[PDB]
Each structure stands twice: as C-alpha cells, then as structure tokens.
Amino acid sequence: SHIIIFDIHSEYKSAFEIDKNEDFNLNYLDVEKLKLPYWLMNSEELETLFIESNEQNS
Amino acid sequence: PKLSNGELVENRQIYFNEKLEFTSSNTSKATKASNGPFNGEFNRFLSRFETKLTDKRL
Amino acid sequence: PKLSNGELVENRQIYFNEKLEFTSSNTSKATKASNGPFNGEFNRFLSRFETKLTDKRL
C-alpha cells in the first residue's frame, strides 16, 4: 500500500502511530527541515518566490 | 559598461564574481557615460531579495 | 536601429538571420540613441514561447 497525506491540522498523526514492537514504520515528515532545493523551480515558481506583484516592471 | 575605476566590462558574467561599482553618467567626453535601462529600477526588488536571503524561516 | 558596436541596421532583414544586441540610449549627438516604440515591455510572452519550443512532449 502507498498513501500520501497532505494534512494541515496534523490531526491524523495519532491515528497512524502504533507501538514500535509491531514493526509498523511511519514516514512522518517535518517540512520545517525537509530541505527542498530551490534550484528545482521553474520560471513562475521562482518569480513568485522572489518577485512580488507590487512591482510593475516584472 | 564602465566601472568606477574605468574598467570596461567585456563579459557580464564577471558580475557573479563580485559586486562591481560603476562610474557616474556624464556628457563630457572625459567621463562620458549613460545610465542603462535597468539602472536604478529594481531597488525595491533588491531590498526584498536581501530580506529573503536574511530570513529565519525558509 | 543601432548595434552595440555602433553599426546601424541598414536592413531589418538581418533580424531574421540572427539575434543582435543593441547599445543603450544616450542624449549626446556623438552616440545618440533612444528607445523604440515598444522597448522592454513584453518579454514574458517570449519566456512562454521558449518554454513551448523546448518542450519534448509535443
């Protein structure tokens, strides 16, 4: 089985965590230190990350 | 492009090596120069980029 | 139109042969130049054009 969850309230963590003696590994990832490279972005993503809509000379 | 010391920029890639200080635009042939179209246009963008580089959450 | 090195564009047909870089605008008559009717106001269209051209799924 393969499931990815985009939860924002972090409610489901306790619903997917059991005792470690049952050999049920979990991949609970903390995006605060997930290390997403900034060189994988394209035009629109980069210009949104750096430039803002306030400037009229984009 | 002419630097403050009078160096002529053969290739713009040298701008990546270090920040370069340019000469002042003037009409007299002794120090004749003209500000480029991008000169003094994205100061707010520079400030925003510097703020992004110095952030403590990204 | 004036080239970067000072040469003048006698025939616009050369634009089809290859890309050319033009010098900046200046007020003095020795190297006088000015912006065109549409200068530096639509190039995001060029960006999406290049993105469409370089796609390999089409």
Task: For the structure shown, list the relevant keywords.
1 helix; Complex; part of a larger assembly; 3 chains; ATP-binding protein; antiviral protein; ATPase
Please characterize this protein's 3D structure.
It is classed as antiviral protein. The entry lists the keywords Complex, topoisomerase, ATPase, antiviral protein. The entry is titled "Apo HerA of HerA-Duf4297 supramolecular complex in anti-phage defense". Chains A, B, C are ATP-binding protein. Organism of A, B, C: Bacillus sp. HMF5848. Chain A is largely without helices or strands and 58 residues long. Chain A is 14% helix and 0% strand. The longest helix of chain A is centred in the last third of the chain and has 8 residues. The radius of gyration of chain A is 18 Å and the shape is elongated. Chains A and B meet through loops of A and helix 2 of B.
Query: Largest chain-chain contact?
Result: B-C, 7 and 9 residues
Radius of gyration of chain A: 18 Å
The main pleated sheet of chain A reads as: none
Number of helices of chain A: 1
Mass-distribution shape of chain A? elongated
| Helical amount of chain A | 10-25%
Percent of sequence in beta strands of chain A:
under 5%
Order of helices and strands of chain A: H
**Secondary structure: number of strands of chain A:** 0
Oligomer designation: part of a larger assembly
Separation of termini of chain A? 45 Å
* Structural classification of chain A: little secondary structure
